[PDB]
Design a protein around this nucleic acid. Structure first.
Length: 62
DNA sequence: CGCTAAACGGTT
DNA sequence: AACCGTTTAGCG
């Protein structure tokens, strides 16, 4: 049983990208604080940051 | 299709 | 526990 695909709001995407520009890796507390501010689950933030690092590494390589 | 969220098996 | 590298798949 797969989880439904989260559709992030524009506010959530803007805040996630502002976080990522500041810090490429978050502490457990910072990750939880971001999830709470955005009404997202801890896992959805953790997964967004992980996939964001994948995209970031792709862009670094060119 | 392209982007990207979630899942897999493996690593740190 | 979280991450990595990669895959799988949802959807505009």
């Amino acid at each position: 049983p797969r989880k439904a695909r989260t559709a992030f709001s524009d506010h959530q995407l803007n805040q996630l990208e502002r976080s990522f520009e500041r810090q490429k890796y978050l502490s457990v507390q910072d990750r939880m604080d971001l999830a709470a501010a955005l009404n997202l689950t801890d896992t959805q933030v953790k997964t967004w940051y992980q996939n964001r690092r994948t995209k970031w590494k792709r862009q670094t390589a060119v």
